[PDB]
Amino acid sequence: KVFGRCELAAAMKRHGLDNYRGYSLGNWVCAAKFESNFNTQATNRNTDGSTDYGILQINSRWWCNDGRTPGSRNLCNIPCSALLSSDITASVNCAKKIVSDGNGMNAWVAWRNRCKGTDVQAWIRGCRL
Ligand SMILES: CN(C)CCCN1CCN(Cc2cccc(C(=O)O)n2)CCN(Cc2cccc(C(=O)O)n2)CC1
Numbered sequence: 001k002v003f004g005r006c007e008l009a010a011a012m013k014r015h016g017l018d019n020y021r022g023y024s025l026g027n028w029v030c031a032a033k034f035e036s037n038f039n040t041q042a043t044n045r046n047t048d049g050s051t052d053y054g055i056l057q058i059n060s061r062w063w064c065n066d067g068r069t070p071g072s073r074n075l076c077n078i079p080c081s082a083l084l085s086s087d088i089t090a091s092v093n094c095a096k097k098i099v100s101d102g103n104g105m106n107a108w109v110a111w112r113n114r115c116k117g118t119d120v121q122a123w124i125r126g127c128r129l
């Protein structure tokens with residue numbers, strides 16, 4: 001599924017991401033834009049052999065199992081394919097675990113380089129939330 005911007009905002013809000021660990025909703029929408037372009041089916045292979053999955057490009061090195069990342073963990077206890085569904089529940093629950101780790105949203109390199117410090121509220125402007 002390719003979400004619309006306000007569609008994704010509404011879904012993230014309903015699953016409790018707005019203000020989660022102090023990160024306003026626009027931070028999460030911005031992260032999703034530059035991680036996946038709002039595409040739940042996005043996948044990208046990393047240099048180390050791990051793969052990033054879904055709307056928030058969650059990495060198999062730590063968070064999900066894809067059977068092809070030797071030595072990795074599965075801390076969200078989920079197949080990585082579950083992060084590609086049109087229903088973002090699994091991605092949101094896993095994201096909550098990720099952002100609760102010591103580094104906050106810096107875990108998402110695209111958030112750090114493209115969202116952090118910018119006017120992230122723009123990403124929810126005009127949305128009926
Ligand atoms: C930059 N890296 C690519 C991020 C990877 C972060 N983790 C690295 C090792 N991590 C341990 C660790 C050691 C020292 C620093 C950090 C950190 O900055 O989080 N984490 C294992 C635990 N896993 C989840 C978890 C669950 C509960 C508590 C904690 C925690 O207290 O850190 N962590 C997170 C993976």
Ligand SMILES: [Cl-]
Pocket residue numbers: 005033
């Ligand atoms: Cl957009």
Ligand SMILES: [Cl-]
Pocket residue numbers: 065066067068069070071072
């Ligand atoms: Cl694996």
Ligand SMILES: [Cl-]
Pocket residue numbers: 072073074075
């Ligand atoms: Cl594990």
Ligand SMILES: [Cl-]
Pocket residue numbers: 011086087088089
């Ligand atoms: Cl959904």
Ligand SMILES: [Cl-]
Pocket residue numbers: 021022103104105
């Ligand atoms: Cl933080």
Ligand SMILES: [Cl-]
Pocket residue numbers: 024025026027120121122124
């Ligand atoms: Cl915001």
Ligand code: NA
Pocket residue numbers: 060061062063064065066069072073074
């Ligand atoms: Na893994």
Ligand SMILES: [Tb+3]
Pocket residue numbers: 101102
């Ligand atoms: Tb950690």
